[PDB]
Every structure is written in C-alpha cells, then in structure tokens.
C-alpha cells in the first residue's frame, strides 16, 4: 500500500501532478502539500481540496466568494471531503482522510480553490485503485 502523495503548488500556478492514486487497501490517505517558490499566501496561496467531480465547480465558486481570509473555502461546505489550509511559499500542510469516504463508481477531483487557480488547471483526478 502507498497511502500518501507529496504535491507541490508553485509560483507559476501549477500542481506537479494531475492524477492521484489511492490504493483501496489504505485505511487512510495523506496528501503532503508544499509551495515551492517565493510568492506569499496573499498573492499565490494554494490549498488542496477534494470533492466529487460534480461538486467541484460549486466549491470553487463559493470558495472564491468566501475570499482569502477564509482560505478560499465556504465555511462548513459539506461538499468538501478533505482539505489543507491555504499555504504560501516555504509553507506546508498535510491532510489525512478516511479512504472509506470514497465510494465505488463515483468520480473524484482534487483542486486548489484559490481565486481562478483551478480554471488555470490546478486540478486533477483522484482515483481509488
Ligand atoms: Cu492555488
């Protein structure tokens, strides 16, 4: 079982992966997010957020509306399965989630909810294997 992934969000508005695999034997799964570069949170903060494919657009839209001081996430958003905080350069965060929260046949997406980042393709698939 490989139950973790290290991901980077950079000063150029990209993640260094667009596909995460979760071994289904993993009871829990960990995402270790870091931010190469030197842009601070208020300019190019990133987070890592997991939802169903169908819920992504909404989480993103509501997140942008919620604003930077709420880490670009609507408080108590039930569409959000797991998430890191918003981080700037030299910062890091991790999130660990229950792998049983991922159901068969469902499509999952990860993304950064910061204003316009996901549109710029800071997103990818998350898949149970
Ligand atoms: Cu971002």
From Swiss-Prot:
<dbReference type="GO" id="GO:0046914">
    <property type="term" value="F:transition metal ion binding"/>
</dbReference>
<feature type="binding site">
    <location>
        <position position="122"/>
    </location>
    <ligand>
        <name>Cu cation</name>
    </ligand>
</feature>
<dbReference type="GO" id="GO:0042597">
    <property type="term" value="C:periplasmic space"/>
</dbReference>
<dbReference type="GO" id="GO:0005507">
    <property type="term" value="F:copper ion binding"/>
</dbReference>
<keyword id="KW-0186">Copper</keyword>
<keyword id="KW-0479">Metal-binding</keyword>
<keyword id="KW-0574">Periplasm</keyword>
<dbReference type="InterPro" id="IPR014068">
    <property type="entry name" value="Azurin"/>
</dbReference>
<dbReference type="InterPro" id="IPR028871">
    <property type="entry name" value="BlueCu_1_BS"/>
</dbReference>
<keyword id="KW-0249">Electron transport</keyword>
<protein>
    <recommendedName>
        <fullName>Azurin</fullName>
    </recommendedName>
</protein>
<comment type="function">
    <text>Transfers electrons from cytochrome c551 to cytochrome oxidase.</text>
</comment>
<feature type="domain" description="Plastocyanin-like">
    <location>
        <begin position="1"/>
        <end position="129"/>
    </location>
</feature>
<dbReference type="InterPro" id="IPR000923">
    <property type="entry name" value="BlueCu_1"/>
</dbReference>
<dbReference type="Pfam" id="PF00127">
    <property type="entry name" value="Copper-bind"/>
</dbReference>
<dbReference type="InterPro" id="IPR008972">
    <property type="entry name" value="Cupredoxin"/>
</dbReference>
<keyword id="KW-0732">Signal</keyword>
<dbReference type="GO" id="GO:0008270">
    <property type="term" value="F:zinc ion binding"/>
</dbReference>
<feature type="disulfide bond">
    <location>
        <begin position="3"/>
        <end position="26"/>
    </location>
</feature>
<dbReference type="GO" id="GO:0042802">
    <property type="term" value="F:identical protein binding"/>
</dbReference>
<dbReference type="GO" id="GO:0005886">
    <property type="term" value="C:plasma membrane"/>
</dbReference>
<keyword id="KW-0813">Transport</keyword>
<dbReference type="InterPro" id="IPR050845">
    <property type="entry name" value="Cu-binding_ET"/>
</dbReference>
<feature type="binding site">
    <location>
        <position position="46"/>
    </location>
    <ligand>
        <name>Cu cation</name>
    </ligand>
</feature>
<dbReference type="GO" id="GO:0009055">
    <property type="term" value="F:electron transfer activity"/>
</dbReference>
<keyword id="KW-1015">Disulfide bond</keyword>
């Amino acid at each position: 079982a490989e139950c973790s992934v290290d991901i980077q969000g950079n000063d150029q508005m990209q993640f260094n992966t667009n596909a995460i695999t979760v071994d289904k034997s993993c009871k829990q799964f960990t995402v270790n997010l870091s931010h190469p570069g030197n842009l601070p949170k208020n300019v190019m903060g990133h987070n890592w957020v997991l939802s169903t494919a169908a819920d992504m657009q909404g989480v993103v839209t509501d997140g942008m509306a919620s604003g930077l001081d709420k880490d670009y996430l609507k408080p108590d958003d039930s569409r959000v399965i797991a998430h890191t905080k918003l981080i700037g350069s030299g910062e890091k965060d991790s999130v660990t989630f229950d792998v049983s929260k991922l159901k068969e046949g469902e499509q999952y997406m990860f993304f950064c909810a910061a204003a316009a980042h996901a549109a710029a393709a800071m997103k990818g698939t998350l898949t149970l294997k």
